[PDB]
Amino acid sequence: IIASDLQTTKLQNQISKIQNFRVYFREGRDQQWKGPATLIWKGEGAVVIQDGQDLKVVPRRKCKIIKDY
Amino acid sequence: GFLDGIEKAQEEHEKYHNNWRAMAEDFQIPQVVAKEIVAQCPKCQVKGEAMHGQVDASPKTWQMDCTHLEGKVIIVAVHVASGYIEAEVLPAETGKETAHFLLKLAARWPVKHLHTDNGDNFTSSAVQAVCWWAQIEHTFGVPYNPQSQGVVESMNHQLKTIITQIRDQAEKIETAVQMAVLIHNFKRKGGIGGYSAGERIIDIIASDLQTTKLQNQISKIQNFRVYFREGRDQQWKGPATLIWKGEGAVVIQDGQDLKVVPRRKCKIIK
Amino acid sequence: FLDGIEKAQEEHEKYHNNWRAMAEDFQIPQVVAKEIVAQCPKCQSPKTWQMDCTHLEGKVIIVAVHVASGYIEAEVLPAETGKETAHFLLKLAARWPVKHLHTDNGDNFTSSAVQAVCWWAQIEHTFGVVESMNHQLKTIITQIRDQAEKIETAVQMAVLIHNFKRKGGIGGYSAGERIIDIIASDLQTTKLQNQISKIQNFRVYFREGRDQQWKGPATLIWKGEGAVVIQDGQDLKVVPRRKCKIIKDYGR
Amino acid sequence: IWKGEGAVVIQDGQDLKVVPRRKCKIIKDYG
Amino acid sequence: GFLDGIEKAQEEHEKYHNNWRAMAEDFQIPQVVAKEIVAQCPKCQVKGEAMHGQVDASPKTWQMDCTHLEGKVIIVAVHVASGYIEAEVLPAETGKETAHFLLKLAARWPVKHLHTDNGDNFTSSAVQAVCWWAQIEHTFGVPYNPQSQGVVESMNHQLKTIITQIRDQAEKIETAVQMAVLIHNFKRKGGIGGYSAGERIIDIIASDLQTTKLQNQISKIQNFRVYFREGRDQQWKGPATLIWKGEGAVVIQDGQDLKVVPRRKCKIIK
Amino acid sequence: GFLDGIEKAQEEHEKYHNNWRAMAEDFQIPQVVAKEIVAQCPKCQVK
Amino acid sequence: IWKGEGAVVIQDGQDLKVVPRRKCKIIKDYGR
DNA sequence: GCTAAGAAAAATCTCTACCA
DNA sequence: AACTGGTAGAGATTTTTCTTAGC
DNA sequence: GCTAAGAAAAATCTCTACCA
DNA sequence: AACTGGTAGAGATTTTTCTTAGC
Numbered sequence A: 001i002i003a004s005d006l007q008t009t010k011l012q013n014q015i016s017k018i019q020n021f022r023v024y025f026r027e028g029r030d031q032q033w034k035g036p037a038t039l040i041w042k043g044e045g046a047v048v049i050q051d052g053q054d055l056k057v058v059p060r061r062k063c064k065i066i067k068d069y
Numbered sequence B, E: 001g002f003l004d005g006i007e008k009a010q011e012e013h014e015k016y017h018n019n020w021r022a023m024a025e026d027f028q029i030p031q032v033v034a035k036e037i038v039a040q041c042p043k044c045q046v047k048g049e050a051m052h053g054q055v056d057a058s059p060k061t062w063q064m065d066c067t068h069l070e071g072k073v074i075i076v077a078v079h080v081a082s083g084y085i086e087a088e089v090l091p092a093e094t095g096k097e098t099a100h101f102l103l104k105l106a107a108r109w110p111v112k113h114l115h116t117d118n119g120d121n122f123t124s125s126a127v128q129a130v131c132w133w134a135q136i137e138h139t140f141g142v143p144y145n146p147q148s149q150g151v152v153e154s155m156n157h158q159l160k161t162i163i164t165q166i167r168d169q170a171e172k173i174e175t176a177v178q179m180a181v182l183i184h185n186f187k188r189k190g191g192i193g194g195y196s197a198g199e200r201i202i203d204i205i206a207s208d209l210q211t212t213k214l215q216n217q218i219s220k221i222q223n224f225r226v227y228f229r230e231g232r233d234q235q236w237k238g239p240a241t242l243i244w245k246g247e248g249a250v251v252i253q254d255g256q257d258l259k260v261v262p263r264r265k266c267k268i269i270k
Numbered sequence C: 001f002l003d004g005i006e007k008a009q010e011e012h013e014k015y016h017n018n019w020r021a022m023a024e025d026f027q028i029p030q031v032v033a034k035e036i037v038a039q040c041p042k043c044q045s046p047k048t049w050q051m052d053c054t055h056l057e058g059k060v061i062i063v064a065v066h067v068a069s070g071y072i073e074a075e076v077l078p079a080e081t082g083k084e085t086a087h088f089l090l091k092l093a094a095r096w097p098v099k100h101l102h103t104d105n106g107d108n109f110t111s112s113a114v115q116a117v118c119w120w121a122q123i124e125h126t127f128g129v130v131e132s133m134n135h136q137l138k139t140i141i142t143q144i145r146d147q148a149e150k151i152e153t154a155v156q157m158a159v160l161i162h163n164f165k166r167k168g169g170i171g172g173y174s175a176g177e178r179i180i181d182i183i184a185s186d187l188q189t190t191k192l193q194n195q196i197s198k199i200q201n202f203r204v205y206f207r208e209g210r211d212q213q214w215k216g217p218a219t220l221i222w223k224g225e226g227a228v229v230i231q232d233g234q235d236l237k238v239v240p241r242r243k244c245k246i247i248k249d250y251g252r
Numbered sequence D: 001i002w003k004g005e006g007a008v009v010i011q012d013g014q015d016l017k018v019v020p021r022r023k024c025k026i027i028k029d030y031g
Numbered sequence F: 001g002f003l004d005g006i007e008k009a010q011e012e013h014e015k016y017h018n019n020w021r022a023m024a025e026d027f028q029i030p031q032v033v034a035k036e037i038v039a040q041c042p043k044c045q046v047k
Numbered sequence G: 001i002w003k004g005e006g007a008v009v010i011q012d013g014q015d016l017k018v019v020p021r022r023k024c025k026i027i028k029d030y031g032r
Numbered sequence H, J: 001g002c003t004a005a006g007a008a009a010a011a012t013c014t015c016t017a018c019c020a
Numbered sequence I, K: 001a002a003c004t005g006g007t008a009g010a011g012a013t014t015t016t017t018c019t020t021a022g023c
């Protein structure tokens, strides 16, 4: 009972430290910097982010991705 | 110690928005802590990561755009792998004329992939119907990012410089556009092979067809299955087709995927 | 090497092979094989187009055909004057290499506008395949007529079906594959001819075995890392580089 | 060496490598 | 031969405007002749030589410009060697207010050289009168070339980003401009010495004064005249002052010009 | 961010006097700040 | 006090003295 | 007769503006 | 979760080619 | 007691947008 | 004949510093 709780907390710790990133992006006709969003997919050249239950594709030249220590 | 310095640095950044070198020198905290104080601020974070991507350059990809010259509308298509240009003057910038231009282009050359921006004539039901009938995959760029279509905007620049060079030899603008297309395609050399654009599109399409037929004839008479050992765990994967054996490594095909495996981790079976 | 050159000369003396086949079979370079063909007395078009006008549903269809492959470019004209014919010819010459044009003695084909376009684009025009291609295109146009609304759409859809969907002939190819193969073969021949003239502007003095006197001026054919192929006395022979001296020749 | 559907095997200076198809140009290069 | 090829290449370029690689391959002429055929054409020659210059960065040079923000007029001056900024909001873009701004700047700091563009407020009789009274040399840039004043346009960019960072802490725009000047001058570090802009202007001006006084005291007690031999002809030039003698070369002053002469070509005389 | 982890690690060491690798692994803070939290305590010693 | 390429200046017993680097071991101190 | 200096000519590398 | 800057010319630097003086 | 592997932390290098 | 692009931040790669296992 206790051992399964320890193993579950270890696996959830690894899963929580894999892909919890924040994205600040720049989009629109007047290109303003907008708030945080969640990274979904990251390819070379562009990223797919989820912001306010809307999917957007941003080039990596117009975004900043913040990790966790 | 520096824990009270960390609290003072948070108050100071909340007022003045220092960068990390100013806080790490004024309050004598380490640089990881000052970098975290700046990185947890939303009023900062206004800068991108300073790189460029690379566009798709397959042997059947075309890019398309519209430009303006003397109150007319020119539409330009470019073959990406060679630099080969087709261009025309439209009476209007509607979707019907863009669909007719795309249908003539597909009737002349093999088109399998089209890349455009998000203009109103390209996001149209007529263009969608022509792409459905002629079996073309249409992709659009990220909005307000002209670097996604870099080749056709570079060719907009080249076409306009040639038109100002030969402008006084024609009466109308449409004659001058077709003369500039001829000068670009056949009278300018230099590039990958020292070619012009017409010689390069002939070489690219002919080499594509010849190399598919050659490796069809090669693969239909093969033998020598290969069993190989790879992965993070030293497992054994299934039947792989040997393609080429070199002095140092071998080339195998597994699940229509090509892999280069060294000679120690594989065995050939007749 | 020299065994391959002698075998290629004997085989050409029997059967008169071509230079691509001899270069692939006997494993010699292509400039040597081209010289073997060029020395034979018994061994000595990719850019010609035909144009015509036809009628359909009160509209004028103008058709150009590439003769060596059967490749088609068509259009629908607003009238049958010489200005629209000159504009169609200028577009065709802008997209494909056109050097020889064959037409009939029509009015719009014999005009000052067509004459000025042929002068600017350097085309040889001759007045007298297109009729067979017009009949085949019109059978396709009546076959796919109900899939389109206008006549220009049906014309371009029939051009696509003719060029890329109908296969036949010897190997079973369409017309687009045949025109690209023909033009690529001509491009290979012209590039090799440029290399041949640039190499053959030299001259070779060679020193034969067990002689200390230099021989006559032999023309250079091929220059390798360790071998040199020369022509002398209507004979080809291979001399190594340690007994050769290559000098420029000014014999225009 | 081999041209696949989404990858190309090339030999560059006695080094075999696998490049994507969209990053290659295959010529015969008369010259 | 290729002499008839040269005549054909001239006719062909007159019609089509080929580049030199196309003519050198089609007509088989050498590349020097084809380069000359292109270089003698006026319809070509539309391209610059692809380099950048470097601006004057003496320790008493200032650059100045005007920018716009929310319907106001900001005027910015920058000290070039340190990056030190003064900025204000003007009621209008006339020459009277620009002359008053320049007079306050000259009353605060030592100004000897001013560089501006060709705006109407800078090419003015009031600015000319202030520069005459305060003994400032005014230079103007090449017209419609903003790269001549590169430092002050870079600082226009930095000032606007800081103003958007601290905008919600002030009511008016003038308070926000002065808060941004304080944040730039004293709260941002990194550069030549790891300094801010205020520490760097203090270091530059203080080191200038100290090094002049030190070498005045050094040069007033010198001796050791030097006779040296240089030039394309092995001549002898006149009395030169020895400044420093190093292991390998010596430093001499001749006609207020500094020269580094090796030790073989000189003799020291007491 | 780990600055809230710094405040929580200070409270946790004031109660239980943890070692520095334990605080660095549990609160996800760097090792320099964890050694400093141990170093400012008069009863403890980083070893 | 000072760490040189070959010398080290230390304070001990209200006295300053110079010890060479071959007879010294420098360790971090956590004595806040 | 053979080598090598010296200059001409060709090839390769870095960097810029413009494309709504 | 499946996207992306590129082209061509102007000089600068390095390498290859060609003629002739000298032993 | 001394060395060295391994990881954390700091320093240096390349490249981008924006400034009418 | 006397003029001229620059600044600062985001990652990537390399170097220095610090703790601990092992002989």
Ligand SMILES: O=C(NCc1c(F)cc(F)cc1F)c1cn2c(c(O)c1=O)C(=O)N1[C@H]3CC[C@H](C3)O[C@@H]1C2
Binding pocket: B065, B066, B117, B118, B119, B120, B144, B146, B147, B153, B154, H019, H020, I005
């Ligand atoms: O800024 C443009 N070019 C200049 C440029 C470049 F080419 C390449 C670069 F790397 C940088 C550049 F600055 C440019 C802008 N737009 C369009 C263009 O085609 C276009 O070339 C376009 O069609 N649209 C439609 C889709 C939505 C609406 C109409 O706005 C956009 C705006």
Ligand SMILES: O=C(NCc1c(F)cc(F)cc1F)c1cn2c(c(O)c1=O)C(=O)N1[C@H]3CC[C@H](C3)O[C@@H]1C2
Binding pocket: E065, E066, E117, E118, E119, E120, E144, E146, E147, E153, E154, J019, J020, K005
């Ligand atoms: O294009 C400008 N900046 C952007 C920019 C840059 F900063 C630096 C770059 F390397 C490139 C850039 F594109 C710009 C233009 N002008 C003036 C500016 O100050 C100015 O910054 C200005 O004052 N004048 C006056 C003098 C005559 C009239 C009024 O037109 C000019 C126009």
Ligand SMILES: [Cl-]
Binding pocket: B117, B118, B119, B142, B143, B144, B145
């Ligand atoms: Cl767009």
Ligand SMILES: [Cl-]
Binding pocket: E117, E118, E119, E142, E143, E144, E145
């Ligand atoms: Cl100006």
Ligand SMILES: [Mg+2]
Binding pocket: B065, B066, B117, B119
């Ligand atoms: Mg567009």
Ligand SMILES: [Mg+2]
Binding pocket: B065, B066, B146, B153
């Ligand atoms: Mg565009």
Ligand SMILES: [Mg+2]
Binding pocket: E065, E066, E117, E119
């Ligand atoms: Mg200005």
Ligand SMILES: [Mg+2]
Binding pocket: E065, E066, E146, E153
């Ligand atoms: Mg300005």
Ligand SMILES: [Zn+2]
Binding pocket: B013, B017, B018, B038, B041, B042, B043, B044
């Ligand atoms: Zn901040």
Ligand SMILES: [Zn+2]
Binding pocket: C012, C016, C017, C037, C040, C041, C042, C043
């Ligand atoms: Zn024959």
Ligand SMILES: [Zn+2]
Binding pocket: E013, E017, E018, E038, E041, E042, E043, E044
């Ligand atoms: Zn020209």
Ligand SMILES: [Zn+2]
Binding pocket: F013, F017, F018, F041, F042, F043, F044
């Ligand atoms: Zn404690």
